[PDB]
Amino acid sequence: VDPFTRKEWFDIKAPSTFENANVGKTLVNKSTGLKSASDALKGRVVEVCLADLQ
RNA sequence: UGGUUCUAUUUUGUUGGUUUCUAGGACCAUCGUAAUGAUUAAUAGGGACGGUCGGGGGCAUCAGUAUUCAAUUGUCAGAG
Secondary structure: OOOOOOOOOOOOOOOOOOOOOOOOOOOOOOOOOOOOOOHHHOOOOOOOOOOOOO
16 A cells, blocks of 8 residues: 555754754654644654754 | 566575575666777679770661553564
8 A cells, every 4th residue: 555655744843942953854644524634643752862953 | 887677595493475685597778898890802793984886676767779560752573
């Protein structure tokens, strides 16, 4: 089937109270008639050293 | 030095019983006699005191940290 044709990406920002806002990306997963995707992977964390932020 | 108390050999006939004579008991106060009378204080002991020492004990608190487990957290093939 493939398990990366469907896989929409994303961008990670960060408080402004920091430097390079810019962290990298993530992978998530689209939907149907009725049902949703964005919420379907939000709440979740990302953890990057102090460093690529200050 | 009393007194006190016991006597009970000895003579005023004597055998026994008051009771006075002399002599032995014994005692608490009593003026007198005395260098008046109490062994060191075991590098044996027990104790007190003083600074102390110690992971000696009990009752309570206190912190480390690993393990296990579970949540949260991520990544993704074998791990043991």
